[PDB]
Design a protein around this ligand. Structure first.
Ligand SMILES: [Zn+2]
Ligand SMILES: [Zn+2]
Lengths: 216, 216
């Protein structure tokens, strides 16, 4: 089946990057900004499929939110199993994924200002439609992204937040992190605001036979 | 559904009680003898139905051979459960059951003999068709019946072969009992020969309107 997408446009009012508050999280918005960095078109895991190690039973359509999620309770028999699955990478569905960095326009920047930034996520057919240096108007939903490293990623590769640079001492303990959840353990979960975009617009052949076709 | 029965008769040769050997176990035979005792028509459990204590899931059609058998693996993988079921006596199917004791005929008995005996099982529609003192010809299958008391009956009522009389010392250790099975444990299982019968035959109103109906 074709994973469908719905693209909204022509919203009444447009927002700037400095109007982004947490009270619009989950709402449909439109924003404007200048693109300054784009990444590769990576494949994102959409509908996962696994096989039980012992039964060989097949599970399909396991939704994933922000981290690699395997199924829990086994399928149709008596077999008891909490883990040890094998992803069937061939059966699983994937999608295109891209991350772009944008900053404020030259006019919205005050007289003395260090420009604010944001992370916009393009997915599906909207990849590569924003090029660095251009001025583009995005529209989508404002979301919040947690730190998955302290959410217990399967591999040892995360290695509990390995770092190369020193974090800010000013916001050490000032950034309010929630605790209590069993998956976290004694850890503290943190959040940051990002944007997810569904529609992108920009606001800033010598063959005779094919040429005659286009014109009215 | 009607639990059906098949009744065979008119076999070529008939056997006496003293021709019963273990090498015909499972075969279709016909025997003759004089009935000397009959029991009540008790209900036998045919198709059992249970409900899981926690899930409340319903299992049905659990076959039983010679002892009260509950299911093992649950209907749903989720809840794990090896025991603690509740028989749904209303949903279960039952059948009629009767045990009759027979002995050898007056002619087949030698000049000096203590008559041999046998246990014949009548089931279904064949109950009460054999009356004590009569001479009847049975036909069915020769089976073997184990001792269920040492097969781990659920209740404490069996109390590991409670007895009121003293067993034979002559056959103490002489009766060959098999061991090794995990259900038995270190116990020894014993067998005895009985007969299961499917067809029985015997070989030894002042109302005018209804009377006129029967005659040709
Ligand atoms: Zn399994
Ligand atoms: Zn259950």
């Amino acid at each position: 089946e074709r994973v469908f997408q719905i693209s909204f446009f022509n919203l009444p009012t447009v927002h700037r990057i400095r109007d982004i508050r947490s009270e619009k999280i989950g709402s449909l918005l439109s924003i404007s900004g200048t693109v300054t960095r784009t990444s590769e078109v990576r494949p994102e895991l959409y509908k996962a499929s696994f096989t039980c190690d012992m039964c060989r039973a097949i599970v399909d359509n396991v939704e994933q939110s922000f981290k690699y999620t395997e199924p829990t309770f086994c399928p149709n028999p008596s077999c008891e199993n909490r883990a040890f699955w094998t992803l069937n990478v061939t059966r699983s569905r994937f999608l295109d994924w891209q991350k772009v960095r944008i900053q404020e326009n030259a006019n919205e920047i005050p007289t003395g200002s260090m420009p604010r930034t944001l992370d916009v996520i393009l997915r599906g057919d909207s990849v590569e439609r924003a090029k660095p240096g251009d001025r583009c108007k995005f529209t989508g939903v404002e979301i919040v992204v947690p730190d998955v490293t302290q959410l217990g990623l399967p591999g040892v590769k995360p290695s509990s937040t390995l770092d190369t640079r020193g974090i800010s001492k000013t916001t050490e303990g000032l950034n309010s992190g929630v605790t209590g959840l069993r998956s976290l353990g004694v850890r503290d979960l943190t959040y940051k605001i990002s944007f997810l975009a569904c529609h992108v617009i920009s606001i800033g052949e010598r063959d005779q036979e094919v040429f005659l076709n286009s014109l009215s």
